[PDB]
Amino acid sequence: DQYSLVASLDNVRNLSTILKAIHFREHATCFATKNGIKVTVENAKCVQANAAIQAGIFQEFKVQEESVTFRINLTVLLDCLSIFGSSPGTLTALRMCYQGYGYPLMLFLEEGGVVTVCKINTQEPEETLDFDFCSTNVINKIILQSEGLREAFSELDMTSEVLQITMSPDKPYFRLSTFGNAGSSHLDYPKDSDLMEAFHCNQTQVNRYKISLLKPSTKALVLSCKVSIRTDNRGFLSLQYAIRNEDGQICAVEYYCCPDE
Amino acid sequence: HHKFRAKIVDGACLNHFTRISNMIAKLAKTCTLRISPDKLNFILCVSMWCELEQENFFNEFQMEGVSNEIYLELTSENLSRALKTAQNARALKIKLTNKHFPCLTVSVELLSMSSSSRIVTHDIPIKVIPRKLWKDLQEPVVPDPDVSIYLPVLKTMKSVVEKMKNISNHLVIEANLDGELNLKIETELVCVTTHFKDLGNPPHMAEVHIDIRKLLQFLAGQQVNPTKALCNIVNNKMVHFDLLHEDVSLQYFIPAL
Amino acid sequence: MKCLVTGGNVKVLGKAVHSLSRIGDELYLEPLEDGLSLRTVNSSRSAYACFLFAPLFFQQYQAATPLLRCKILMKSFLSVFRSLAMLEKTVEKCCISLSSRLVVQLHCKFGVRKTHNLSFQDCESLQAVFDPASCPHMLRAPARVLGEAVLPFSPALAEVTLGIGRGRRVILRSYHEEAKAMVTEMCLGEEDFQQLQAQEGVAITFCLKEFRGLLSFAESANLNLSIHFDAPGRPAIFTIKDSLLDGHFVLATLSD
Amino acid sequence: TSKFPHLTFES
């Protein structure tokens, strides 16, 4: 009878921008609880990007049971949300309704009277696998200004197969490395750099990561002011981002990446 | 025994004329140009008909055809490229020639940085059309439609059509005589319907399934939101966009599937 | 060898690398006593280009290891320098050094350092046999003048004919082999030419795409371009000369 | 178009 989940926004871009930071696969899993929605995108049982938008953002957010979960086509969903494009500056409101299992995800968007109605069929979720990332056994952790790191990630030597991250209390403190054809590229960040917000490195650690897996984290990087980089005692890499939306509120985006042996 | 000589001196008029050819190049690769003593036309037959008022653009103009029209088809890229050189020129002279092969020659007096005149000459290759084919190359009549409704803001239409294209190539457009217009796509996984309202009509809902690419090709390559945007619909056969802006008519015809 | 570029000369070096990339796929490095030489060559060996950076162009210049001839894929050397926007804004000093690898260090702001270790193959001194003094015809004008001349040509046009018409006109005709293409002809007067010593009727034809590569570099730097050429078949020489900088493009011309 | 005589290089 009643819907299982409803959500309203006076500005749809307070949802679209965040999903863009996660959009590197075709399908996404949505987790709606009392405390907002947690959209997760995973690949190769090695990469996982989480977008947790809090209920405070929405002008309306109601959930029935404690757990609500559906798998959705992130590409289509993001097409519908941006179907009125990006005018310079009247907003585009969104009514988002999900009846339940077997029922589609309904979107309703309005801009200057023009109304767009979307029916997106869902899908039974595949097992989203758990990376047990605890701050308990985290070894190294630095917090950097994203503005200067975008160059490091978008001028990427894609001919290389891995990205070598080195964090250390000694020189070179923070170094990103690629090893492609006819070229070895490095990038040093001193701990006393003004780009550094926090430098908590206890022990020298060198980890390799599949370059194909860390590259789509650029989508989150260029939407954040600062980026947090942690590695644990497993060699797993964490990327916490700080995306501020258009209403002065901040939601969290997090990437995880299995190391490469 | 065909003769054509035209010249442009006004910059504001030159800007206008250049915007036109750029649009045609985005609407067609090969188009037909009609040279009449009073007007100027661009034809592609999906059909596109475009009319110009000659005296609004040119300072000089001479037209002679043996028995009062002249038809010739160009590659629109060639005409657009040639005009783009005259972005700030002093003089723009267009004459028909027949040197190595019959051409449409555009002479340009480029801005003299100083001293001497910089003169560019583009020999645009043409193809003359015999009167036996002129009849099959005329403005497609608008056979009285089911619904006639004023189009909404083309930028908004273009924006919506752009995203729909990424999903399907089939667009259902239905207009209503009270001011309703709907854009609609359907798929196994997703359905999208956009509702336009309070558009107004000139003095039931007729629909037509069209290739969404052809509509987007029309909306993109449109310079400015026109002063007259009109959509005519013949039920499940034809859709026609009557446009006028700044003394330049533009007819565009997309057939059903 | 130890080169060190600072200040605004950092971007200038990048523009030269960009300019050489529109000619050949490999970058030849040759440190000399009179400065650093960057050279390249066509895949048809019908075009040669060379930039010479006089020793005062640099903060510090050591030529020989107490001699170096180098060969690097310019795809690589491009990516090191691509986008001068990030080269102007961030890069303060640029260091090039030489063992097993050619190293390039970019000392950016806030202590940030970018380091490239490019692999290289030893090679010969890529030199073309050419001499401007041997050429009977000469043109000379500011680059911007010649940059406005090639403006009405399609950027996809490969070939252009340079000729001297009656009345001391400099004529640029587009070139095509015999399906109808648009023919564009540009006509300059001798007035906006600083120097013009070329016999009427003389005309040559060369690759427009490569001539543009030199133009793009010299236009921005506001330099003077001089063209020296002979009869069809014989190479055309395009020279650029600053106090800090030397640079010449040698292009092949059509025969008969 | 692309029938340019070779430039003579030293090696």
Numbering used by the authors:
A (entry chain C): 13 to 100, 103 to 275
B (entry chain B): 0 to 44, 52 to 73, 77 to 212, 226 to 279
C (entry chain A): 1 to 66, 70 to 101, 105 to 184, 190 to 267
D (entry chain D): 88 to 98
What does the paper say about this structure?
Eukaryotes have two types of DNA clamps: the replication clamp PCNA and the checkpoint clamp RAD9-RAD1-HUS1 (9-1-1). 9-1-1 activates the ATR-CHK1 pathway in DNA damage checkpoint, regulating cell cycle progression.
Crystallization trials of the 9-1-1 ring in the presence of the RHINO peptide were performed, and crystals suitable for X-ray diffraction study were successfully obtained. In contrast to the RAD1-binding region of RHINO, which binds to the edge-to-back side of the RAD1 subunit, the RHINO peptide (residues 88–99) binds to the hydrophobic pocket on the front side of RAD9, across the IDC-loop of RAD9. The side-chain of Phe91 of RHINO is accommodated into the subsite-1, and the side-chains of Leu94 and Phe96 of RHINO are accommodated into the subsite-2. These side-chains interact with residues in these subsites through vdW contacts. The biochemical and structural analysis revealed the mechanisms underlying intra- and inter-molecular interactions on RAD9, suggesting that the representative sequence for binding to RAD9 would be FxxLxF.
